[PDB]
Amino acid sequence: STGSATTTPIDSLDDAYITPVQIGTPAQTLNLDFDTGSSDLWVFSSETTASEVDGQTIYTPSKSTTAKLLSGATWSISYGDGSSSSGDVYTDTVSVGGLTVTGQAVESAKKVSSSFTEDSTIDGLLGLAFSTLNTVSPTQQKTFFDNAKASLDSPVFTADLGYHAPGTYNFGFIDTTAYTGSITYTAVSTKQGFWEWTSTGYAVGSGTFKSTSIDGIADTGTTLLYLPATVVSAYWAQVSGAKSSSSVGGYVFPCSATLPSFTFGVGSARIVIPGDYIDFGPISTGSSSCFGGIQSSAGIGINIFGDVALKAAFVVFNGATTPTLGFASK
Numbered sequence: 001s002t003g004s005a006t007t008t009p010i011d012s013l014d015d016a017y018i019t020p021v022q023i024g025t026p027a028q029t030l031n032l033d034f035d036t037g038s039s040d041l042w043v044f045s046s047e048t049t050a051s052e053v054d055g056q057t058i059y060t061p062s063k064s065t066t067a068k069l070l071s072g073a074t075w076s077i078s079y080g081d082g083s084s085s086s087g088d089v090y091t092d093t094v095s096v097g098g099l100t101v102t103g104q105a106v107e108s109a110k111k112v113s114s115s116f117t118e119d120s121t122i123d124g125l126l127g128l129a130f131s132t133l134n135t136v137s138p139t140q141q142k143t144f145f146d147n148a149k150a151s152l153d154s155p156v157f158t159a160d161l162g163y164h165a166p167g168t169y170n171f172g173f174i175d176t177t178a179y180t181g182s183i184t185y186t187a188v189s190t191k192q193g194f195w196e197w198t199s200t201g202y203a204v205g206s207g208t209f210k211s212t213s214i215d216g217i218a219d220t221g222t223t224l225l226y227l228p229a230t231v232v233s234a235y236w237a238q239v240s241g242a243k244s245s246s247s248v249g250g251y252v253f254p255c256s257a258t259l260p261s262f263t264f265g266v267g268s269a270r271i272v273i274p275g276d277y278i279d280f281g282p283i284s285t286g287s288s289s290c291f292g293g294i295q296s297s298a299g300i301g302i303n304i305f306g307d308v309a310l311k312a313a314f315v316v317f318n319g320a321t322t323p324t325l326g327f328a329s330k
Ligand SMILES: NCc1ccc(C(F)(F)F)cc1
Pocket: 035, 036, 037, 038, 079, 080, 081, 219, 220, 221, 222, 300, 302, 304
């Protein structure tokens, strides 16, 4: 079997993408953030603290004939940006774009951090990293992708994120009309539980390609591109008036500047990120300083190929016994 669902940016800057997901019987439709950097499916629910909910759609397990409490199980998760959430665990039926999994662990949030509460467009997260990162205790739970794997035509899913436009998440098949040229596959290390891979180098604008190995993760749940300080300094040095700001927390640039493109390597192939993709707009309403989409990973400890990079490509997450990542121009 297969599934296909449209994913839509939550705002005019593509800060995140939400995808409708059906949970329970009868279906309760929630808009979830598909996150290849984590492995928990957690949702706002009727069990979330009332003061911590501001306009989100909530999952109500008491109205689902298929919901079962996973007795004794708890979850607690903290994201790299400081966000966090925790609660208990139900099992229920979950469908994405026609693809249905029964007995999927649905982690009901009793407490959520402030950054989730103030984001009324995101009802929860659907983790698509490897199940070794799932935070359910004492019995670790499988992701939606892992549970669906056996019934999928092919053990793959693809991310086709749009620039200021809707895109597509496909499960179980590769849409050969969605990309141009060939798909370049590259090896994945699962050692840390991420879709971790090694980029073969980079170029800034029309400059020479610098062959160097950049280890990083493919993370649909991260907005920006986080790369080593040397790479990020070489990019912003080409933008008149750009500078790293301690008060803002990253590189900013005059909104009147035009940004060069950024090229990253996948084996022998090249993926070009247009300069417009790196513009994240004024740091405050009416400001003439704009925030950059390429930032240093030095504070984080891991390089992150977030939405800025992934939306420039058609990306195949191949969950075969030897996992691989495929990149194609589109
Ligand atoms: N989008 C999920 C996510 C968030 C943060 C990290 C970090 F910071 F640990 F790299 C990995 C994955």
